[PDB]
Amino acid sequence: DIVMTQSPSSLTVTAGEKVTMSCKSSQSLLSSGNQKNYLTWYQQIPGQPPKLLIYWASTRESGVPDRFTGSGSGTDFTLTINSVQAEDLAVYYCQNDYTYPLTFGAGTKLELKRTVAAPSVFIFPPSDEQLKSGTASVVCLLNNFYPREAKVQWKVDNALQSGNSQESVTEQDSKDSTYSLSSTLTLSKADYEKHKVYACEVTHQGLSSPVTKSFNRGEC
Amino acid sequence: QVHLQQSGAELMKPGASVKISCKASGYTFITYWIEWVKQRPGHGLEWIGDILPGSGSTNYNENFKGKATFTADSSSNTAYMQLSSLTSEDSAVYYCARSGYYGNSGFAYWGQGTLVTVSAASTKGPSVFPLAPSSKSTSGGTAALGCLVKDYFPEPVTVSWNSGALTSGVHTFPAVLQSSGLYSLSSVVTVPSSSLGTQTYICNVNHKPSNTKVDKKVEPKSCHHHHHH
Ligand SMILES: [Ca+2]
Numbered sequence: 001d002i003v004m005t006q007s008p009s010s011l012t013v014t015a016g017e018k019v020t021m022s023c024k025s026s027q028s029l030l031s032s033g034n035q036k037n038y039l040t041w042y043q044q045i046p047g048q049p050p051k052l053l054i055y056w057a058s059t060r061e062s063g064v065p066d067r068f069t070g071s072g073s074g075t076d077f078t079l080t081i082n083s084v085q086a087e088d089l090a091v092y093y094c095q096n097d098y099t100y101p102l103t104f105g106a107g108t109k110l111e112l113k114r115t116v117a118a119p120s121v122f123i124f125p126p127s128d129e130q131l132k133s134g135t136a137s138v139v140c141l142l143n144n145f146y147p148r149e150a151k152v153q154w155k156v157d158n159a160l161q162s163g164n165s166q167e168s169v170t171e172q173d174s175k176d177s178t179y180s181l182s183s184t185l186t187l188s189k190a191d192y193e194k195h196k197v198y199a200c201e202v203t204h205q206g207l208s209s210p211v212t213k214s215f216n217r218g219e220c
Numbered sequence: 221q222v223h224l225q226q227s228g229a230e231l232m233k234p235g236a237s238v239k240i241s242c243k244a245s246g247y248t249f250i251t252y253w254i255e256w257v258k259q260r261p262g263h264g265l266e267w268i269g270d271i272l273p274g275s276g277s278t279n280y281n282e283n284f285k286g287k288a289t290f291t292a293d294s295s296s297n298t299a300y301m302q303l304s305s306l307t308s309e310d311s312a313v314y315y316c317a318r319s320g321y322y323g324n325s326g327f328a329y330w331g332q333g334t335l336v337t338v339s340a341a342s343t344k345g346p347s348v349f350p351l352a353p354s355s356k357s358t359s360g361g362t363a364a365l366g367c368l369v370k371d372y373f374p375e376p377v378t379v380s381w382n383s384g385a386l387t388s389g390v391h392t393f394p395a396v397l398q399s400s401g402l403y404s405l406s407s408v409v410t411v412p413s414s415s416l417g418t419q420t421y422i423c424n425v426n427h428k429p430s431n432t433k434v435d436k437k438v439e440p441k442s443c444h445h446h447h448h449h
Contacts, residue, residue, distance in 0.1 A: 040326035042265075049315055049330035050257075050265065056325065093265055097324045101281045102255075104265040120410075122357035122364040125441075127349040130368075139351055141364055141408055143391070168393040168405065180391045182406050184368070213356065220354045220443040 002027045002096040006105035013084050014113045015177070021108040023077040023094035029057075030074045031098070038098035039077050041070055044107075045090045046171040054079065055097065086112055087174045112177040118206025119145035119181070123213040125220050126192065136192035140200035140213065142181040144173070151203035152183040155212075156195050161185060192217070222246040224316055224331040228428050231337045231374045236306050240334045242299040242316035250274035253319035254292065254299040255327050260312040270319075273299060306338045337374035341401060345432035346372035348425050351406065352441040358413045365438050366408035367423035371400070372430070379407035380424040386411075416440040 003026035013019050029039045037057035042050040052061045054070035057077055067082040081088060091107040119142035126136040142150060148169070154161035165185045172179060183200065199214035227241040242254060256268040269280040273292035280288070287310075292299040303310055314334045317327035351357075351366035358364075369377050379392050389410040395403040407423060417440070425434045 038324045049333055052326040052328050055320060061328065097326060100279045102267045104267060107264040120359050124351040124357055130349045137368055137370065139368060139406060143364065143410065166396045168396050170391055170393060182393045215356050216446065219445060220356055220441045
């Protein structure tokens with residue numbers, strides 16, 4: 001089998017700049033039969049199937065911007081992206097398109113670097129309809145922040161919580177290169193009705209000092 | 221235009237089988253190879269094999285010999301992949317794709333992918349709760365609202381807003397597996413706080429594996445401290 005090795009594993013670039021990534025094959029992909037290098041590049045953006053970018057090492061698929069350039073020969077191939085755009089956020093895969101079995105590289109993850117952006121912080125009390133079912137989920141939303149690093153702490157009447165919250169983070173946004181984060185605190189109806197203040201405490205670089213969003217039970 | 225339409229997400233128990241379909245349109249079905257690709261997180265793309273419909277010719281990744289079986293019916297323009305003796309390692313998104321117009325020119329068209337879950341756990345529809353917009357989810361005139369989609373199995377669920385008319389500022393979070401073994405996620409959206417009284421906001425939640433469709437109207441709430449007047 002032809003082993004495809006991609007490097008770097010990942011990289012972080014500022015929009016507008018140039019990126020270069022490499023794809024090596026364990027055996028030559030050059031057909032001495034016609035002088036074509038049968039190497040294919042794909043872009044896979046978040047939540048989407050892979051998209052064909054380049055084939056025969058250097059030919060762009062119709063519709064693909066000219067700032068994507070494939071180069072190389074034999075066993076050493078390069079994808080170059082000039083003037084990188086926020087929407088170029090993706091994992092890029094190369095593929096042996098020469099001989100069976102067809103094989104893929106492990107991918108190069110392209111991440112975007114941008115100016116620091118502080119999260120907008122929102123808090124949601126549990127719904128009346130969930131409370132009826134005997135459970136209370138309190139949601140804290142951190143919206144549109146950069147960089148990814150963030151700390152969210154739940155406080156219930158000034159007491160720090162542990163083991164009763166779960167956290168989810170989106171992939172970088174294709175337009176503004178930010179992340180969003182949800183933190184859900186879950187307790188029983190009975191345990192919820194034992195307390196007054198439900199607070200979400202947020203630490204991030206875009207914040208000079210940690211931010212607290214809170215409500216009193218029953219207030220909303 | 222060329223289109224590949226795959227069958228819906230599936231749950232099957234360990235040791236059983238699953239069959240995924242890939243319906244082709246907009247081209248001559250027997251002219252092009254149908255490719256099958258496996259994707260699990262942390263394992264990039266993995267080539268399973270291919271078939272040229274009408275010819276019976278197949279090619280395998282030898283690691284899938286004894287696991288995957290390819291067929292195609294030229295009459296219905298449909299390719300199939302069956303996966304046998306399922307294990308948790310077979311849990312993944314599976315794509316079909318079509319070979320290129322020009323020859324050895326990449327997989328130019330892709331199906332949307334089919335999520336396969338291999339688990340003993342039973343199917344369960346989600347509960348859908350509103351995340352109401354209020355002064356606690358308002359900053360500088362922009363208001364956050366959403367729906368919490370809780371306690372379902374297996375993945376995936378889809379969430380849309382106002383039947384697809386509202387896409388700006390939507391964030392649908394990756395599902396988290398709760399300790400219970402059920403999934404939970406939230407879908408949120410930011411909007412001007414002034415439209416809260418005049419615009420209706422509805423999250424459309426679909427969990428196809430359990431045939432659950434919920435349209436949840438998200439109503440604004442008012443906030444006030446508990447005091448006597
Ligand atoms: Ca099926």
